[PDB]
Design an enzyme around this catalytic site. Sequence first.
Site, mmCIF file in Angstrom:
data_model
loop_
_atom_site.group_PDB
_atom_site.id
_atom_site.type_symbol
_atom_site.label_atom_id
_atom_site.label_comp_id
_atom_site.label_asym_id
_atom_site.label_seq_id
_atom_site.Cartn_x
_atom_site.Cartn_y
_atom_site.Cartn_z
ATOM 1 N N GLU A 190 -8.870 -10.563 16.519
ATOM 2 C CA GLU A 190 -9.026 -9.469 15.456
ATOM 3 C C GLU A 190 -9.531 -8.112 16.187
ATOM 4 O OE1 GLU A 190 -11.868 -7.687 14.856
ATOM 5 O OE2 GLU A 190 -11.392 -6.518 13.086
ATOM 6 N N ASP A 199 -3.321 -18.269 -13.920
ATOM 7 C CA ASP A 199 -2.086 -17.450 -13.165
ATOM 8 C C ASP A 199 -2.235 -16.199 -13.369
ATOM 9 O OD1 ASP A 199 -1.421 -20.179 -12.031
ATOM 10 O OD2 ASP A 199 0.407 -20.089 -13.098
ATOM 11 N N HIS A 213 0.240 -2.304 -1.274
ATOM 12 C CA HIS A 213 -0.799 -2.223 -2.542
ATOM 13 C C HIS A 213 -0.674 -0.726 -2.963
ATOM 14 C CE1 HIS A 213 -4.112 -2.801 -5.118
ATOM 15 N NE2 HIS A 213 -4.177 -4.091 -4.994
ATOM 16 N N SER A 254 3.507 16.437 -13.955
ATOM 17 C CA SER A 254 2.715 16.097 -14.744
ATOM 18 C C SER A 254 2.100 14.564 -14.631
ATOM 19 C CB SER A 254 3.451 15.979 -16.245
ATOM 20 O OG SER A 254 2.522 15.086 -17.405
HETATM 21 ZN ZN LIG Z 1 -15.454 -7.770 14.297
HETATM 22 ZN ZN LIG Z 2 -15.158 -5.460 16.252
#
Ligand SMILES: [Zn+2]
Ligand SMILES: [Zn+2]
Lengths: 692, 692
Positions: free
Chosen positions: A369, A608, A631, A573
């Site tokens: 991460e 769903d 998104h 608009s």
């Molecule tokens: Zn972290």
């Molecule tokens: Zn971190």
Amino acid sequence: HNMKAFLDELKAENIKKFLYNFTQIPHLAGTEQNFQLAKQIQSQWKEFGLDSVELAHYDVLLSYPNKTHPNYISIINEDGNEIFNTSLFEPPPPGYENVSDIVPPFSAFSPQGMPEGDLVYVNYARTEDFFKLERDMKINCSGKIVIARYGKVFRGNKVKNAQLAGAKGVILYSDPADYFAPGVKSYPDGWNLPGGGVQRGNILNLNGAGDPLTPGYPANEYAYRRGIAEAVGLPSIPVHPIGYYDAQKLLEKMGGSAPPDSSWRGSLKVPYNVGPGFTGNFSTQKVKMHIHSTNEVTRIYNVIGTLRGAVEPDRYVILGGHRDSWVFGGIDPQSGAAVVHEIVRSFGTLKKEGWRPRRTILFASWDAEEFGLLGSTEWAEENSRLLQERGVAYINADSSIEGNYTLRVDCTPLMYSLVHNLTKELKSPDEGFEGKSLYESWTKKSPSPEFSGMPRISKLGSGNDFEVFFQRLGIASGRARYTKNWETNKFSGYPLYHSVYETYELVEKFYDPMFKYHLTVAQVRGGMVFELANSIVLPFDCRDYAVVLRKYADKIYSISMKHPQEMKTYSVSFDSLFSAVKNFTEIASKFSERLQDFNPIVLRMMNDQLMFLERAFIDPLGLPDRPFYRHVIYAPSSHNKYAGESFPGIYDALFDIESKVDPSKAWGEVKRQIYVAAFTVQAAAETLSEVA
Amino acid sequence: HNMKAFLDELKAENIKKFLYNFTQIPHLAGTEQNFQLAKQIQSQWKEFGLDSVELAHYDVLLSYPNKTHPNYISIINEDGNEIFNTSLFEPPPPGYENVSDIVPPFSAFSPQGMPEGDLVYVNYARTEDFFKLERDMKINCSGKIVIARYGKVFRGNKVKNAQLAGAKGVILYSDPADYFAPGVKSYPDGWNLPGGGVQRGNILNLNGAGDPLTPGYPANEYAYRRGIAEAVGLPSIPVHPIGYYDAQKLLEKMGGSAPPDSSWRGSLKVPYNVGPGFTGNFSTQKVKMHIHSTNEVTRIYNVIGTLRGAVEPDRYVILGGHRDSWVFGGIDPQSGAAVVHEIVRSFGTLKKEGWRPRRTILFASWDAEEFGLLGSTEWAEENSRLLQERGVAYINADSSIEGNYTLRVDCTPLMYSLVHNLTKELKSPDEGFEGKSLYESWTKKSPSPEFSGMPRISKLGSGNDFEVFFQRLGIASGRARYTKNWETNKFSGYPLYHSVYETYELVEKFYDPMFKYHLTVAQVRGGMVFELANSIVLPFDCRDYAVVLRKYADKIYSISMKHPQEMKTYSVSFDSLFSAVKNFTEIASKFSERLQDFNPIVLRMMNDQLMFLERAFIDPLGLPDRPFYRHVIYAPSSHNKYAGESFPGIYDALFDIESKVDPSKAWGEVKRQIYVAAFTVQAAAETLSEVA
Ligand SMILES: [Zn+2]
Ligand SMILES: [Zn+2]
Ligand SMILES: *[C@@H]1O[C@H](CO)[C@@H](O[C@@H]2O[C@H](CO)[C@@H](O[C@@H]3O[C@H](CO[C@H]4O[C@H](CO)[C@@H](O)[C@H](O)[C@@H]4O)[C@@H](O)[C@H](O[C@H]4O[C@H](CO)[C@@H](O)[C@H](O)[C@@H]4O)[C@@H]3O)[C@H](O)[C@H]2NC(C)=O)[C@H](O)[C@H]1NC(C)=O
Ligand SMILES: *[C@@H]1O[C@H](CO)[C@@H](O[C@@H]2O[C@H](CO)[C@@H](O[C@@H]3O[C@H](CO[C@H]4O[C@H](CO)[C@@H](O)[C@H](O)[C@@H]4O)[C@@H](O)[C@H](O[C@H]4O[C@H](CO)[C@@H](O)[C@H](O)[C@@H]4O)[C@@H]3O)[C@H](O)[C@H]2NC(C)=O)[C@H](O)[C@H]1NC(C)=O
Ligand SMILES: *[C@@H]1O[C@H](CO[C@@H]2O[C@@H](C)[C@@H](O)[C@@H](O)[C@@H]2O)[C@@H](O[C@@H]2O[C@H](CO)[C@@H](O[C@@H]3O[C@H](CO)[C@@H](O)[C@H](O)[C@@H]3O)[C@H](O)[C@H]2NC(C)=O)[C@H](O)[C@H]1NC(C)=O
Ligand SMILES: *[C@@H]1O[C@H](CO[C@@H]2O[C@@H](C)[C@@H](O)[C@@H](O)[C@@H]2O)[C@@H](O[C@@H]2O[C@H](CO)[C@@H](O[C@@H]3O[C@H](CO)[C@@H](O)[C@H](O)[C@@H]3O)[C@H](O)[C@H]2NC(C)=O)[C@H](O)[C@H]1NC(C)=O
Ligand SMILES: *[C@@H]1O[C@H](CO)[C@@H](O[C@@H]2O[C@H](CO)[C@@H](O[C@@H]3O[C@H](CO)[C@@H](O)[C@H](O)[C@@H]3O)[C@H](O)[C@H]2NC(C)=O)[C@H](O)[C@H]1NC(C)=O
Ligand SMILES: *[C@@H]1O[C@H](CO)[C@@H](O[C@@H]2O[C@H](CO)[C@@H](O[C@@H]3O[C@H](CO)[C@@H](O)[C@H](O)[C@@H]3O)[C@H](O)[C@H]2NC(C)=O)[C@H](O)[C@H]1NC(C)=O
Ligand SMILES: *[C@@H]1O[C@H](CO)[C@@H](O[C@@H]2O[C@H](CO)[C@@H](O[C@@H]3O[C@H](CO)[C@@H](O)[C@H](O)[C@@H]3O)[C@H](O)[C@H]2NC(C)=O)[C@H](O)[C@H]1NC(C)=O
Ligand SMILES: *[C@@H]1O[C@H](CO)[C@@H](O[C@@H]2O[C@H](CO)[C@@H](O[C@@H]3O[C@H](CO)[C@@H](O)[C@H](O)[C@@H]3O)[C@H](O)[C@H]2NC(C)=O)[C@H](O)[C@H]1NC(C)=O
Ligand SMILES: *[C@@H]1O[C@H](CO)[C@@H](O[C@@H]2O[C@H](CO)[C@@H](O)[C@H](O)[C@H]2NC(C)=O)[C@H](O)[C@H]1NC(C)=O
Ligand SMILES: *[C@@H]1O[C@H](CO)[C@@H](O[C@@H]2O[C@H](CO)[C@@H](O)[C@H](O)[C@H]2NC(C)=O)[C@H](O)[C@H]1NC(C)=O
Ligand SMILES: *[C@@H]1O[C@H](CO)[C@@H](O)[C@H](O)[C@H]1NC(C)=O
Ligand SMILES: *[C@@H]1O[C@H](CO)[C@@H](O)[C@H](O)[C@H]1NC(C)=O
Ligand SMILES: *[C@@H]1O[C@H](CO)[C@@H](O)[C@H](O)[C@H]1NC(C)=O
Ligand SMILES: *[C@@H]1O[C@H](CO)[C@@H](O)[C@H](O)[C@H]1NC(C)=O
Ligand SMILES: [Ca+2]
Ligand SMILES: [Ca+2]
Ligand SMILES: [Cl-]
Ligand SMILES: [Cl-]
Ligand SMILES: [Zn+2]
Ligand SMILES: [Zn+2]
């Protein structure tokens, strides 16, 4: 076997023991120690009773300092003598001075180089800081080394901004203004950053891509990699982080222009002159970076645990958080990982007594991460078809604490009602609120800016593992943790963030001695997963989306309305957007009536429609030049990856529009984005209409 | 109320009456007459008993000749006198000589212009024809007017190829070699094209985009349009179609190089010299086009009928075909539209007796198919979220006949078993096969090239309204019609294609006097819809995909293996693709076992795995430079939109690779495409694994 049974089984003492267990040695992504911890977690989750627990591995681009060729910065004189050198390591904390494999402070993914030049101080290196420098102060950063204080925005945005200003290097530092709370002592005697402390962190601009070499596709064994020159998101100038003892030495000699105002001045006994370069006597001295870090394809390991659903095994509720840390990860991520561990253990006890959740629960220990959400993203790329057809919800589980004052929740509007209801059923851990609900303490300490009697819930931003699930795939997502007072929050995080000082002792001594805030966060995250995985009707309220869409439409309209002449000239608009939002509001209201007024097929049909509602806000074409931010309602801010922006396509089209050379083209693009947003809102609404 | 009840209700006499009704006046897209027919169909489908029938309208770019400034081509002499002019209209057929609003022959979306130059004859203007001209014959088309015979490939590909060769105009014509069957008379006395006959048709290269001005988004009331210069797929040179009387006049004087071989010679009493320009005596004469057509945003109307499912109303089985025609549409599309009309009527009778299908059936009368699949594509863009989460299958219903010899079926492998089974239960309409099944006559007349005892079923190509559903959205799709003998098929269609002579009488007199082939096609298309909408378990066999994936992998491998040295140098392996195909085969086999060995949730879970299997072959990133062709297994050929290509990403990466300047880069891209294909096959396989 109900939620109360699940919740009561969670123990503060267990979270404490796990945190201790996870924080004795560094667990840097791609290292042997983190592979060993992965294997441990896998073993324990099997023991705890999960149906299957596998490792999913990928080979991704990571970045490490060169152990025999250290990174450092110098002040260099006329003759080329290095008269001052920044530190090669953070002084290790008490009792860890013999711990090996502490990665020295570095900026992950910096290119190599030894640039020499004059310094320019750029405040927080935000877009508006560079606007101030170049437009108002007429200071040119081209070929300069910029020095910027950490804080306010994701560091990758600072680097991008410096790069586009023409900087040839960036020095990042922690100012005591932002990372030293008044009246509290430096680690080990309190929770403040000492002058030798340094914040690690990557400086990528991935925009959701995942592994820089394999955008779109998992970095598996036969993957075909982009060459380094075509990689996604790598900085093109060297970058390095330093502490404030070292920063003082670099800043104390700075000449040229004075700071434009006091918001440019930190807390060091230094003028905060912008430069370029040093005062008269030192005008011939220069700053030299020496960066020798290497990018290397390296194996990473996610742990994926499955608890199969009894009734809807093909519906997935995901609890995920990462395991890799910069050093010990006392807060980030192990305070979260310990909470996940205890949640798995509690669900497992119930399972051993013969219980199963209605839907399948997936548990994840993500890797890498810290190097750009690489583990979560590669796994989601691999499993994207399963996730988009079966993914109910994703609950993130990084750091359980960034403070100890009150709750922080950022989530999709679809989860607002779930969160309000769950927190009303949980005990507050706060002093002065004993016997009161968490909902009560939370709304008292963190009132909504809009509604009396309601707590603050923020938009999801980014800089964590929910990004692929929410902004790429459109799976309803949320996060929750303990935080500091919103009122005094300066939005740069806790002082010891990504430093060697972020240890077990930091948490046990200064944040949460009794592990009661950790337990509360376990109850919130686990309670959410429980309800999502077990409730007959998915616990989403579509009407909550209708309310925020109107708020966001008002907001974006107001931004545009600062340019009334242009809106007249180009016939700009917002009527279609407001119409779509009105329609969404009407259809959502009707859908809600049917949801209470209704048969497992009508139910599942209904479920769903609920599950695919977040999915409906996805545009397969993505946002402009950011194909993995799909998104249409929410994207990470183009100026600050940590911040969520609403109607991002329109927002970016309007941003700094008065400075565009071709207003016709610029306002044409505003109109195009209004069209896309109105269409997407209407299309999402229509997924809640009767199906036939 | 079973399939037999549905099938028996279908009447040849009704199809005949509807065909007559639909073909008395032209129904050109965007004209009042076609809006009136839309309103008629809407009314009748309501009458027939559908639950709702609505018009869905869009404003799309269409193209029309200028009524007061006709299109034509000239031979022009030295002085600039026009010594020969091509015809302004097709001689109208008997009894239609007073019918108004017959659009004269033109190439839809041609730009305006009056280019003058020397002619080059380019055979069918295929990629290999241009290779022959430029590489082997050293003839340069730059600044020349190319003349090409229609046939073999979609006309839009001819135009693209001419454009990239540097042509300044294109003349398309119908050679008797391709559009005059030996021994049959010209219309009205037989089914052959007369010398004054001309084939209309658009010359776009949309690659799935739909309306040229609104790629990605429906062309609704508030749509924001690209400017014309940024429109998708428009040709950059003028183009016009002519008949063979006119073509003879343009070709008879051609000099320069002789045709390279006999495959370049058609049937006209002409040398088929390639040029450039004319023989000695006429060398100063030139060819001049005069094209004045205009592109205009115009309203189009789809009719959408719904028959709501009793059990799974949120699952859609779609029967769609277009209504707009070039002129009378006697075959294209009304022979199909009449069949749809009778299918709706039959389903409606059952409904009035209290029956409902298990799943929802949607019926569509699409508009503007002839102008680039615009109606189907804009509607699918509007409803994409509903279609990708709920779309079971799409059955196309354009022309019911292109011949009267045997059945033609092109479909996804997922429908092979369904088609084999249904055709075994239908009566053959063929002479000599009375009392035998359609399956029997079909496999006898159209044997599979691979398997004894099986009929030929082709890959879906494109050039019809299934394109958005199959290659963009990944909804299992199929088509069926009557066709000519495969053995003698020269792959240019029937002689009167898109001509004024394509009338009711053409069909009634020469194709299907008894409407028995139409009835057979109604039974096939309607039978398919019936089974898809009613079968408890979706009637897809995933193992049929496994078989073809291996075939396609062998095929693509074989293409690569013509370059053994390069595969060695660049380490080009197909191992991952074969591995994924092997895995798909194994997982599909196991899934099939469970499908027979298994509870409505397990069923529906099972049905969702079946429904989403076609969906799994979609790559959200699309194919290179063709973002709307997302299916990784099948795309329209980059050289011929009508033809399906398998593993198109790898196929295009390999195509003409020996001619690429940078082999390292070219073979790198072959490897990238192998990776994408192997990954997608594996990911699709994994959707059929146990879910948890
Ligand atoms: Zn972290
Ligand atoms: Zn971190
Ligand atoms: C929010 O939800 C509402 C539905 O309650 C939507 O309302 C639609 O809005 C559009 C206007 O933008 C309407 O479009 C108009 O349709 C007319 C024909 O409609 C007939 O057919 C439909 C079904 O096909 C029926 O529902 C309808 O009752 C009619 O029988 C056209 O004639 C209009 O075009 C004319 O006027 C415009 C504008 O002046 C001109 O530009 C044209 O050239 C032309 O002269 C127009 O296209 C639509 O009818 C409305 N539907 C309904 C059911 O009321 C909103 O669109 C929706 N918001 C968003 C953002 O989607
Ligand atoms: C078709 O389906 C089969 C499954 O039946 C897939 O087989 C996998 O294939 C890959 C090889 O491409 C294998 O990957 C290898 O994994 C080893 C570790 O695996 C362990 O962990 C997994 C779960 O995480 C267990 O399933 C497994 O049994 C082991 O416990 C690595 O050590 C391997 O890497 C080493 O060798 C390679 C190649 O020489 C080197 O490049 C590396 O540097 C390293 O030294 C390797 O990554 C995988 O284990 C197989 N899975 C199974 C279940 O057998 C096919 O991949 C699939 N085809 C496609 C196209 O997807
Ligand atoms: C700041 O650091 C530089 C570079 O020193 C090197 O990198 C550091 C981060 C540490 O890891 C050091 O251990 C490492 O040496 C210092 O400048 C360097 O000084 C050394 C020793 O004085 C020079 O070594 C040479 O030695 C031989 C003679 O024995 C001769 O070949 C040379 O003439 C030279 O003396 C080295 O060249 C020099 N390097 C550079 C790049 O300048 C610097 O002294 C230090 N500054 C401080 C502490 O203020
Ligand atoms: C081929 O067609 C051209 C163009 O004729 C025009 O377009 C056709 C497709 C038809 O729609 C025609 O009805 C239409 O005129 C013919 O050349 C044109 O001939 C006319 C008449 O001879 C010329 O008209 C002018 O008239 C006045 C005098 O009354 C003067 O101003 C001029 O000196 C001229 O005579 C016209 O200029 C000319 N146009 C062009 C573009 O050349 C052509 O005769 C015909 N060829 C055939 C039938 O072989
Ligand atoms: C964090 O907690 C884990 C889990 O309790 C600890 O790992 C475990 O360590 C024990 C004791 O070292 C291991 O047991 C040993 O097994 C071997 C045979 O494999 C045997 O020779 C020994 O007699 C002993 O029984 C155990 O395998 C291991 N469990 C797992 C799942 O990894 C770990 O020590 C703790 N880490 C820290 C830093 O406190
Ligand atoms: C959070 O908790 C609130 C409060 O319990 C939940 O709202 C409540 O939900 C129930 C059950 O659907 C509603 O009961 C219904 O009442 C109507 C009549 O008003 C009746 O027709 C139905 O048969 C049913 O009994 C109740 O009205 C509703 N209360 C309020 C104030 O809205 C809410 O659903 C919970 N949120 C989540 C995500 O679970
Ligand atoms: C193709 O078939 C359709 C449907 O049968 C025909 O349209 C129908 O035509 C009839 C007779 O012209 C119309 O009935 C008339 O209605 C008006 C009142 O609206 C009344 O004044 C007349 O006395 C008569 O009853 C009918 O509305 C119409 N139906 C529909 C659904 O459009 C059409 O004529 C046929 N076309 C051809 C070319 O054969
Ligand atoms: C097209 O028709 C064929 C032939 O009827 C269908 O295949 C047949 O499907 C049935 C029903 O699933 C299979 O019956 C099963 O047999 C096994 C034992 O072999 C038993 O365990 C099950 O309980 C069940 O009765 C039958 O084996 C199978 N026959 C063959 C030759 O495959 C096929 O499914 C039809 N295709 C479609 C798309 O409907
Ligand atoms: C880490 O730094 C050392 C230099 O201090 C690198 O080792 C040298 O590499 C160069 C160029 O490849 C060679 O010419 C030298 O022979 C090496 N010098 C010494 C003193 O060992 C080493 O390659 C770097 N490591 C990484 C992973 O980049
Ligand atoms: C169709 O063709 C006629 C020309 O024969 C066009 O009418 C002319 O347009 C030009 C340029 O706009 C004007 O300057 C003339 O006054 C018109 N001439 C005549 C003789 O009418 C007409 O615009 C074309 N139609 C379309 C839709 O493009
Ligand atoms: C900044 O400096 C560079 C190089 O000296 C120059 O090319 C560039 O135009 C300058 N920009 C401004 C805005 O002065
Ligand atoms: C933890 O809580 C106490 C209140 O008891 C507070 O004074 C202290 O500053 C908090 N710690 C942190 C790290 O914010
Ligand atoms: C063809 O002709 C054009 C223009 O006369 C020229 O520029 C081009 O290079 C030529 N191409 C070849 C392959 O001869
Ligand atoms: C239709 O069928 C007959 C056989 O009876 C055949 O000879 C004729 O050519 C067919 N028509 C067409 C248009 O192919
Ligand atoms: Ca990747
Ligand atoms: Ca469109
Ligand atoms: Cl978190
Ligand atoms: Cl068809
Ligand atoms: Zn056609
Ligand atoms: Zn057609």
